[PDB]
């Protein structure tokens, strides 16, 4: 039974993406309630904005011809008066659509550059040729659940049970923690000999349903996945996103996930820790206020996130809310074409 | 429980629209059967073709430069040898997509013109600078239901119960009647101190479900609304309408609504009073006849309305009928691109 809505309890910075980085949410929650001894502990979890990957915020310079990264550096200085990339913490290999197949393994020792998929154009990091991924942690507290000695999971500060089943050991700046298969990374060494975490990141198969978790539950899980896949396939074939189609990519269960929005015809994503919404009065107290993180969330040009927009009369239009009220707005059906994020 | 089909009992004139004037039908019927005293009465209701709005049938003239509405008047005379607009009866303010945000409040006293959204082009009424909305009524009869003294609703000539709950007082040419929230206007003064009707017309929230009308019923109501919204969003993103997608905008319950068709790659709408269809033999007696209003409805180029078309063999192809018979026609899936109705 999904809640009527899920709202980001914590929302990270917005980073532009293309329609091909969109993904269907993981609407699956694991209970793992076979243990009943609770002990408190403190831990560092990945800061919001770093759970998925760590950004580089680089730039692409066009010469044509092959430029030398000195004039482009000067040109970049004159231009402002970008193009992010993701590292793999297991091996420090840059990831980006411009990189051919991604995997720019050599950034510091092998070479000081790696060209894009297009031969002529090159990409250069804004920061020096090194990866800083150390100040990306926030301190939290939780209630461990460990049965006899092997930890099942823990209940974090938000009251959400996060299981360690299937968790993969991953080390970030000397802190060997565990990457939970819900996405989050937690600084726990309680795992004795769990498998080291493969470099396939979160794109790999999440399993968690081959254990036959109440096939009746998986029925609606697959139904929601099919609805999201219909929306996503429509988005990729039409190359345009509406707010009602963007509302289908929202995570239907509390936990870590992605939040999406359109800012000036640019597709954005952000790390989000969703929380269950029981009533619509929880998140819309006053006329034009969307309550996110204990405050009126600031809209830009009238759009908040996950298909929520400000109406012509100033009302917060949540596509899930409007459908339940049998109200229709052409603003939620207007499809905006998303320009390709990386032409080169 | 919706009928297998609904057919227009009375159909108004066809007026061209763009895909942005399409709307999902109101498939909600109110019973309001708390009163049992029936008394007959006579009334004037809005003639079909005027329930939604009253048309002006204007024209847009292109000079460029700012023309004077004398050469354009002569040019219009030479051209035939249009562009309608809607008034608000509460304030007589013209409505049209070309008007910036609509609301051409000044048409007679304030000014003799109001320019389009594009600065250079202007729009001029075909009729003199005044609004005639008096000969727009038809005489009917009904059975009132008034409990003790406050009217619940009435049963009109078509045997349909039309409730006065939520009705808003509205005056048309000196006849103070009531605008029922199903759309129709009825010349009744039985309402004592019901609220004067806001200028938000039928675009405003219809409510009628916040009263919690059997949430099981609202389940399928919302399901049908979601199907219609899927069809409408597909129509607006693809900018093209097929007959099978146009068949999703049909009102699923008897009452007043909109009928849609494509005439020469032009999207049309008309006022329609739908009636329940119990069998397919009701509306298709002979091979190539669609029975609308007690006669063979005249198709133009083989298309009738609401996705109904004439087949290659001469059979009337109703998309709802064909799906129930497990028959597939490429004619009902052909998407025709709708040119933008008001470029300027």
């Amino acid at each position, epitope marked *: 039974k999904f809640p009527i809505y899920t709202i980001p309890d914590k929302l990270g910075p917005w980073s532009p993406i293309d329609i091909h980085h969109l993904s269907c949410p993981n609407n699956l929650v694991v209970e793992d309630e076979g243990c009943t001894n609770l002990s408190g502990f403190s831990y560092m979890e990945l800061k919001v904005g770093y759970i998925s990957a760590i950004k580089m915020n680089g730039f692409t310079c066009t010469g044509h011809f092959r430029p030398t990264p000195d004039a482009c550096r000067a040109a970049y200085n004159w231009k402002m008066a970008p193009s992010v990339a993701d590292l793999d913490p297991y091996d420090r290999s840059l990831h980006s659509p411009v990189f051919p197949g991604g995997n720019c393994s050599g950034v510091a020792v092998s070479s000081t550059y790696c060209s894009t998929n297009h031969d002529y154009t090159i990409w250069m990091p804004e920061n020096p040729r090194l990866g800083m991924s150390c100040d990306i942690f926030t301190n939290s507290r939780g209630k461990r659940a460990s049965k006899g000695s092997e930890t099942c999971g823990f209940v974090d500060e*938000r009251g959400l049970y996060k299981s360690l089943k299937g968790a993969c050991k991953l080390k970030l700046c000397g802190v060997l923690g565990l990457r939970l298969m819900d996405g989050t990374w937690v600084a726990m060494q309680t795992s004795n000999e769990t498998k080291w975490c493969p470099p396939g990141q979160l794109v790999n198969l999440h399993d968690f349903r081959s254990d036959e978790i109440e096939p009746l539950v998986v029925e609606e899980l697959v139904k929601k996945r099919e609805e999201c896949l219909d929306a996503l396939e429509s988005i990729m074939t039409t190359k345009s996103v509406s707010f009602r189609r963007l509302s289908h990519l929202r995570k239907l269960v509390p936990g870590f996930g992605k939040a999406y929005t359109i800012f000036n015809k640019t597709l954005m994503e952000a790390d989000a820790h969703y929380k269950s919404v029981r009533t619509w009065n929880e998140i819309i107290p006053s006329k034009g206020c969307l309550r996110v993180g204990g405050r009126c969330h600031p809209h830009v040009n009238g759009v908040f996130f996950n298909g929520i927009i400000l109406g012509p009369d100033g009302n917060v239009l949540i596509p899930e809310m409007q459908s339940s009220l049998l109200q229709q707005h052409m603003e939620l059906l207007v499809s905006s074409v998303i320009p390709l994020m990386h032409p080169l | 429980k919706f009928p297998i089909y609904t057919i227009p009992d009375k159909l108004g004139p066809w007026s061209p629209i763009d895909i942005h004037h399409l709307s999902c039908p109101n498939n909600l019927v109110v019973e309001d059967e708390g009163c049992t005293n029936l008394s007959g009465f006579s009334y004037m209701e809005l003639k079909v073709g005027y329930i939604s709005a009253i048309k002006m049938n204007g024209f847009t003239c292109t000079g460029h430069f700012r023309p004077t509405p004398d050469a354009c008047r002569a040019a219009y005379n030479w051209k035939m040898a249009p562009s309608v607009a809607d008034l608000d009866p509460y304030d007589r303010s013209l409505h049209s997509p070309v008007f910036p945000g609509g609301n051409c409040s000044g048409v007679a006293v304030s000014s003799t013109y109001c320019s389009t959204n594009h600065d250079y082009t202007i729009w001029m009424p075909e009729n003199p600078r005044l609004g005639m909305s008096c000969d727009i009524f038809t005489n009917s009869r009904g059975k009132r239901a008034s409990k003790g003294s406050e009217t619940c609703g009435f049963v009109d000539e078509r045997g349909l119960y039309k409730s006065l709950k939520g009705a808003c007082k509205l005056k048309l040419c000196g006849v103070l009647g009531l605008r029922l929230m199903d759309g129709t206007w009825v010349a009744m003064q039985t309402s004592n101190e019901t609220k004067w009707c806001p200028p938000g017309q039928l675009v405003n929230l219809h409510d009628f479900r916040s009263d919690e009308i059997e949430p099981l019923v609202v389940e399928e109501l919302v399901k049908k609304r979601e199907e219609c919204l899927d069809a409408l969003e597909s129509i607006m993103t693809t900018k093209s309408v097929s007959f099978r997608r146009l068949s999703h905008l049909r009102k699923l319950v008897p009452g007043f609504g909109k009928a849609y068709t494509i005439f020469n790659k032009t999207l049309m709408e008309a006022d329609a009073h739908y009636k329940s269809v119990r069998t397919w033999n009701e509306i298709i007696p002979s091979k190539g006849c669609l029975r609308v209003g007690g006669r063979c409805h005249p198709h133009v180029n083989g298309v009738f309305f609401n996705g109904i078309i004439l087949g290659p063999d001469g059979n009337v192809l109703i998309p709802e009928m064909q799906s129930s018979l497990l028959q597939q026609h490429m004619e009902l899936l052909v998407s025709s691109v709708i040119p933008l109705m008001h470029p300027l």
Partner: antibody, heavy 119, light 108 residues
């Protein structure tokens, strides 16, 4: 200054119906979610019902759900609580509270009208 | 519905003394707690919201502290008008819930 005045509270027999009315002034009543909060004698405050700024969304306490019905009239700037099937423990001082524009809190309350449910 | 526990129920002190009121939640309510002061026959008054912020027109002697499960309201100097019933309210979850209330009384 924001003023909330609630009236309509009186002695009612169990199982009967009472309707409370709260009049609002000093603020835009149509842009705020208004709650009803009751305080039983010798007991703490207890949230009863909420109506949204437009009246489309309404929620009630578990002990209240199915019996009371909150409503509002933005034109009248008045908030209504329709108590039905009143029971013995429904007696309390009922406050009409205004929710913060962003917050989860009741920044302004009313004086509170006492409702007594006893034969 | 989660239970806000307020201890002690009765807190007797003297004017010019610090008063420490504690609210404990059944589960963590993050920073979304509010403090209301109510006097007999008078509308309840919002003192502290978000567990730290002070409402408009509230004297500076009222302060809020805590997060998660344990919270605290402190009056720096109990004035004669501060001897009322103080109630803690949270909304981290629906429905809004109040504490049992703590009464501040003058000791003699």
């Amino acid at each position: 200054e924001v003023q909330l005045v609630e009236s309509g509270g009186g002695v009612v027999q169990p199982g009967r119906s009472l309707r409370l009315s709260c009049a609002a002034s000093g603020f835009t009543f149509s842009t705020y979610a208004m709650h009803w909060v009751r305080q039983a004698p010798g007991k703490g405050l207890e949230w009863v019902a909420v109506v949204s700024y437009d009246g489309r969304t309404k929620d009630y306490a578990d002990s209240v759900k199915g019996r009371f019905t909150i409503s509002r009239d933005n034109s009248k700037n008045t908030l209504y609580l329709q108590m039905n099937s009143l029971r013995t423990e429904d007696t309390a001082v009922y406050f009409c509270a205004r929710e913060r524009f962003s917050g989860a809190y009741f920044d302004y309350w009313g004086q509170g009208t006492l409702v007594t449910v006893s034969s | 519905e989660i239970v806000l526990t307020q201890s002690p129920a009765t807190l007797s002190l003297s004017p010019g003394e610090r008063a420490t009121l504690s609210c404990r939640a059944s589960q963590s309510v993050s920073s979304y707690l509010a403090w209301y002061q109510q006097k007999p026959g008078q509308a309840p008054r919002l003192l502290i919201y978000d567990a730290s912020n002070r409402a408009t027109g509230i004297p500076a002697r009222f302060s809020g502290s805590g997060s998660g499960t344990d919270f605290t309201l402190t009056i720096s100097s109990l004035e004669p008008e501060d001897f009322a019933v103080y109630s803690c309210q949270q909304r981290n979850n629906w429905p809004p819930t109040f504490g049992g209330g703590t009464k501040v009384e003058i000791k003699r």
